[PDB]
Design a binder for this molecule. Sequence first.
Ligand SMILES: CC/C=C\C/C=C\C/C=C\CCCCCCCC(=O)OC[C@@H](O)COP(=O)(O)OCC[N+](C)(C)C
Ligand SMILES: *[C@@H]1O[C@H](CO)[C@@H](O)[C@H](O)[C@H]1NC(C)=O
Ligand SMILES: *[C@@H]1O[C@H](CO)[C@@H](O)[C@H](O)[C@H]1NC(C)=O
Lengths: 132, 458, 113
Amino acid sequence: EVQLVESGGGLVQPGGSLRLSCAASGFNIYSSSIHWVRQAPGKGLEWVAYIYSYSGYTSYADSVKGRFTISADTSKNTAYLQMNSLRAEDTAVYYCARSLEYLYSSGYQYKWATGLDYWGQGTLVTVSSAST
Amino acid sequence: LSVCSKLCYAVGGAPYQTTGCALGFFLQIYLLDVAQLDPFYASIILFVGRAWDAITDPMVGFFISKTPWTRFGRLMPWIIFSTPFAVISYFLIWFVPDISTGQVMWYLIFYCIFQTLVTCFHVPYSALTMFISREQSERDSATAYRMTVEVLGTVLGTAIQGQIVGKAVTPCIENPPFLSETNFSVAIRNVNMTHYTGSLADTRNAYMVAAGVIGGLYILCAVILSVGVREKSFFRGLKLVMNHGAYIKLITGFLFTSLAFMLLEGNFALFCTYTLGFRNEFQNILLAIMLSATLTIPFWQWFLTRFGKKTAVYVGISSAVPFLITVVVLDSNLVVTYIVAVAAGISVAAAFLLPWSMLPDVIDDFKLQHPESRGHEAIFFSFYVFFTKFTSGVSLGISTLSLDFAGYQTRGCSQPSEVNITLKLLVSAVPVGLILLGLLLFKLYPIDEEKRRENKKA
Amino acid sequence: DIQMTQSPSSLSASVGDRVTITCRASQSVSSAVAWYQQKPGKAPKLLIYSASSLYSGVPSRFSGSRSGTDFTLTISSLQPEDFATYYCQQSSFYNQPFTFGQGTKVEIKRTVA
Ligand SMILES: CC/C=C\C/C=C\C/C=C\CCCCCCCC(=O)OC[C@@H](O)COP(=O)(O)OCC[N+](C)(C)C
Ligand SMILES: *[C@@H]1O[C@H](CO)[C@@H](O)[C@H](O)[C@H]1NC(C)=O
Ligand SMILES: *[C@@H]1O[C@H](CO)[C@@H](O)[C@H](O)[C@H]1NC(C)=O
């Protein structure tokens, strides 16, 4: 059975280093893709990053480009999201999610799309000088 | 005889041309897109099929006059009996096999069988002229009717195969943005295809429907031809054909030009779709080309009548060069593409109408050079047609092979850079090169509107 | 970036009512939408991808439709387990940032006290 478990959270200092891990079970990461999506405390979902683990194609959100770096490790079957130079507004709950690449028809062309079919449980990170 | 049959004999030219047209334009697009064969094996198929069509013409031409006059005629039972198997083996070319191994043999065998049977239909039908009636004027009128119907049949084949297949466009998968090698073998894994396979089955059913419609036209025209028409050494010849140098010069010239234009036919049918990107309306462009050519043929007849034929060859075949350069120089434009298409249609009509009327002049010159020869008058047409079809097959095979070597991707919707460069060279570099070399070797043809002597002597 | 906008941001409907949630994509064409549903304090669930394709294991109550760049999600019979927040995401690789919509909090409907 498919399972995605996140790791790494807690308090961060503003402008710090935090590697969030997403361990996978019931499927191979090297064969599939992984999205990372954050949800702010009391706000809507916000897509963060994406990776296709076979080729290495990564995409990032416009707010996270140049700060966050997504990667994948097949020796452990785990997705990774490294977070450096963190501002005191990235505090959120981060979910990793397997993608479901499909093809939608645009006339005669079949373009590529991706849906986050199975979602991880999400872990809470608090970027702040002093909290709780 | 009278029009009671000269009309029935006319429609017989349609089966060979429609089947021959829909193939020539669309077959390379079929084996590469809806049949999805390896371009290497598709090149093998095209080369071997057209070479076998070239080979089976003298074979069948000799197989007659050795067959006895039956109760149905001598040349008629060939047409009567080859039609069912012709349409059967023609339907099975546009049908994707029910097997996972031996897909290439399914197309080799049936394309070769259809070539053999369409030859056993066209060659006895072609030779049916000399037995229609004893008056030469009636045979010439029937030949004019037949050539008219053959041009109109090229038009009908293009129109039908384009409008039936145009209703179900071939589905293309855009290059995977998450992939670098552009391989689909990896992207399709873990991905549903029921929608794509459904669209592919739709376009395959459209190709099967077009095959059935063309085969029905074949059957109908063959039945009309068989019910409305009731009829009443070689090594020396090949050594003698090489001793008429004027015919040889005309052959080299017109062969280079016709080869350029058939290369244009096939690789342009593919190029309009993949390089320019008009996958949705390339059938309309092909139909525009063919209609322009067919409507402009009579103008070229008037031109031949006005100037010399040696002037019409230059002007007509050279009209194509600037537009063939324009189409690849400037970017895609469905308004510029129609214009280059109508100009190329005019030039195609010129380049294919000129040999058909200049060859009888070298026949008349040979009748005066060696004026004792009995027979050895259609050997010229046989040689020319054989070296036209064989060379066109070799060139189409080499074209699909070079497209294989450029990294042609099946299921793709945008081909790699080398494939586009090749499709641009196979329409402008190689065709214009061949056209110029043909028009330069045509400067070595002696009859330069001196045909007045060959006419008055006769 | 494409601005996905869910036009209703708080919907009220009791059990049985026909619920409809739209999500206007600013860009005209060549985009797919993916509709997810999130309960309070739980991970989302992919309901409908490709704007009309139910995910395997999702009840048939939900139905998507692409009405001229106006993607829509409808629930035929709101079971008293569908009171969640529904999000639309720009699922298409041609429009790269798969930014989500605003959300549409579905809450029970009753006479104000
Ligand atoms: C980019 C273009 C792509 C493809 C086009 C190239 C090749 C396909 C088209 C045709 C191939 C068929 C070639 C077979 C022989 C040429 C047929 C031809 O075109 O030969 C003219 C002939 O048909 C004249 O017949 P016409 O209708 O003019 O009547 C005459 C009446 N009369 C006798 C009194 C003058
Ligand atoms: C890519 O496609 C080629 C041709 O089908 C194949 O030989 C090759 O192994 C594929 N590469 C993969 C599967 O990564
Ligand atoms: C793909 O989707 C179709 C419905 O469009 C469905 O019938 C088919 O079972 C699906 N196949 C897979 C591999 O999930």
